[PDB]
Design an enzyme around this catalytic site. Structure first.
Site, mmCIF file in Angstrom:
data_model
loop_
_atom_site.group_PDB
_atom_site.id
_atom_site.type_symbol
_atom_site.label_atom_id
_atom_site.label_comp_id
_atom_site.label_asym_id
_atom_site.label_seq_id
_atom_site.Cartn_x
_atom_site.Cartn_y
_atom_site.Cartn_z
ATOM 1 N N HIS A 162 59.198 37.670 18.372
ATOM 2 C CA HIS A 162 59.755 36.744 19.353
ATOM 3 C C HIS A 162 58.651 36.122 20.199
ATOM 4 C CE1 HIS A 162 62.990 35.665 22.345
ATOM 5 N NE2 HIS A 162 61.893 35.606 23.073
ATOM 6 N N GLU A 163 57.747 36.964 20.719
ATOM 7 C CA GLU A 163 56.734 36.461 21.637
ATOM 8 C C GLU A 163 55.695 35.592 20.919
ATOM 9 O OE1 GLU A 163 57.386 36.463 24.592
ATOM 10 O OE2 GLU A 163 58.833 38.106 24.757
ATOM 11 N N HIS A 166 57.027 32.086 20.371
ATOM 12 C CA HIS A 166 56.928 31.149 21.476
ATOM 13 C C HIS A 166 55.647 30.343 21.382
ATOM 14 C CE1 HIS A 166 60.402 31.819 23.823
ATOM 15 N NE2 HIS A 166 60.124 33.072 24.136
ATOM 16 N N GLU A 186 64.086 29.726 22.909
ATOM 17 C CA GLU A 186 64.524 31.117 22.867
ATOM 18 C C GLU A 186 65.115 31.480 21.513
ATOM 19 O OE1 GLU A 186 62.821 32.976 25.195
ATOM 20 O OE2 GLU A 186 64.601 34.147 24.602
ATOM 21 N N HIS A 248 68.117 32.478 28.208
ATOM 22 C CA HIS A 248 68.420 33.695 27.464
ATOM 23 C C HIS A 248 69.900 33.840 27.163
ATOM 24 C CE1 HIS A 248 64.507 35.180 29.223
ATOM 25 N NE2 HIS A 248 64.327 35.266 27.919
HETATM 26 ZN ZN LIG Z 1 66.652 34.972 31.432
HETATM 27 ZN ZN LIG Z 2 61.614 34.460 24.779
#
Ligand SMILES: [Zn+2]
Ligand SMILES: [Zn+2]
Ligand SMILES: [Ca+2]
Ligand SMILES: [Ca+2]
Ligand SMILES: [Ca+2]
Ligand SMILES: [Ca+2]
Ligand SMILES: [Zn+2]
Ligand SMILES: [Zn+2]
Ligand SMILES: [Zn+2]
Length: 328
Positions: A162-163, A166, A186, A248
């Site tokens: 995930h990171e 980004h 996201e 999120h």
């Molecule tokens: Zn958030």
């Molecule tokens: Zn994220």
């Protein structure tokens, strides 16, 4: 001189269990300086930094004595125990391996790329802060807390994927991190978490964070991609978006879309991720709306030769109106 070497040690946590690099998973790719019997948690692709529970660092690689394979850890026993995890530093080195190789093997691209197009090393800052229950991308590196009362150390294939992703997004479409584009940003990172799991172990959970939520916290996962609203806050369809909804939670739209697409007849996760990656690289813009995002997916699917009817069906199921920007 620093030369390649192999690290043996442990990973995992109390929730998912412990496993061993060198038995259950590959050995870790480390570096060694014979002259000083020192090993470093670093290879060309990935460097692990032990933040020592601080918030700032010179980013030197974690180094440990190693007097062809060596046990990891400051005590050369394979461990770097922290808040119920066997070795977040080992897990971070492996997570960087997995995400690097998924992007390279499936797409021929560098997970992180410098402005000149050359590969950018994945810098994984572990043991960040005191009781820090988060992980993030800052424009050049990935940072992972050890967690506290709700979560184990935020180092897993999914969180690492995930990171890093980004960063992939920043360096491709540049989806801005607010509004609908931020929900898409996201979501793309949550999709890549799933791709990292599937690439590595051949299956994925369709959830974000089950492997790091503590069982006594009352939560089984951070997010659910099959039905985002199961978490009580995320949305399942674009019509439920409103300005100010946190990224999120608005990530539910494209998370649900990815789930739906990957489960259409004759599709799979890889094919669905193929569409999303090509859209990220070639079509999505920094200001994208959900609707423009769907047009980018249709264009990407056309380029790949995949079935546009399956894309259109999935877009309509999440209430995306692609007709404004894709007419056929
Ligand atoms: Zn958030
Ligand atoms: Zn994220
Ligand atoms: Ca280096
Ligand atoms: Ca910065
Ligand atoms: Ca505590
Ligand atoms: Ca507790
Ligand atoms: Zn390459
Ligand atoms: Zn720590
Ligand atoms: Zn659904």
């Amino acid at each position: 001189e620093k030369v390649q070497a192999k690290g043996m040690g442990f990973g995992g946590n109390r929730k998912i269990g412990e496993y061993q690099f060198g038995k259950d998973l590959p050995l870790l790719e480390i570096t060694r300086d014979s002259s000083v019997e020192m090993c470093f948690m670093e290879n060309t692709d990935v460097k692990v930094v032990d933040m020592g529970h601080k918030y700032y660092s010179n980013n030197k690689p974690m180094q440990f004595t190693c007097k062809k394979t060596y046990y990891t850890g400051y005590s050369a026993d394979g461990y770097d125990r922290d808040n119920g995890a066997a070795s977040p530093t080992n897990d971070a080195l492996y997570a960087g391996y997995v995400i690097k190789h998924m992007y390279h093997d499936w797409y021929g691209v560098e997970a992180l790329t410098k402005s000149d197009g050359s590969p950018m090393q994945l810098v994984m800052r572990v043991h960040y802060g005191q009781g820090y229950e988060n992980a993030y991308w800052d424009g050049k590196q990935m940072t992972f807390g050890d967690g506290d009362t709700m979560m184990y150390p935020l180092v897993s294939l999914g969180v690492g994927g995930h990171e890093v992703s980004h960063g992939f997004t920043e360096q491709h479409s540049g989806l801005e991190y607010f509004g609908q584009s931020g929900g898409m940003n996201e979501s793309f990172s949550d999709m890549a978490a799933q791709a990292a799991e599937y690439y590595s172990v051949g299956k994925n959970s369709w959830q974000i964070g089950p492997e790091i939520m503590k069982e006594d916290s009352g939560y089984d996962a951070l997010r659910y991609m099959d039905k985002p609203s199961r978490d009580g806050m995320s949305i399942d369809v674009a019509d439920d978006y409103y300005g100010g909804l946190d990224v999120h939670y608005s990530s539910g739209v494209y998370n649900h879309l990815f789930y739906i697409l990957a489960n259409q007849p004759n599709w799979n996760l890889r094919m669905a991720f193929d569409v999303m990656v090509k859209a990220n690289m070639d079509y999505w813009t920094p200001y994208s709306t959900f609707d423009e995002g769907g047009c980018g997916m249709l264009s990407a699917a056309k380029d790949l030769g995949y079935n546009l009817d399956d894309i259109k069906k999935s877009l309509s199921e999440v209430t995306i109106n692609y007709q404004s920007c894709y007419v056929d």
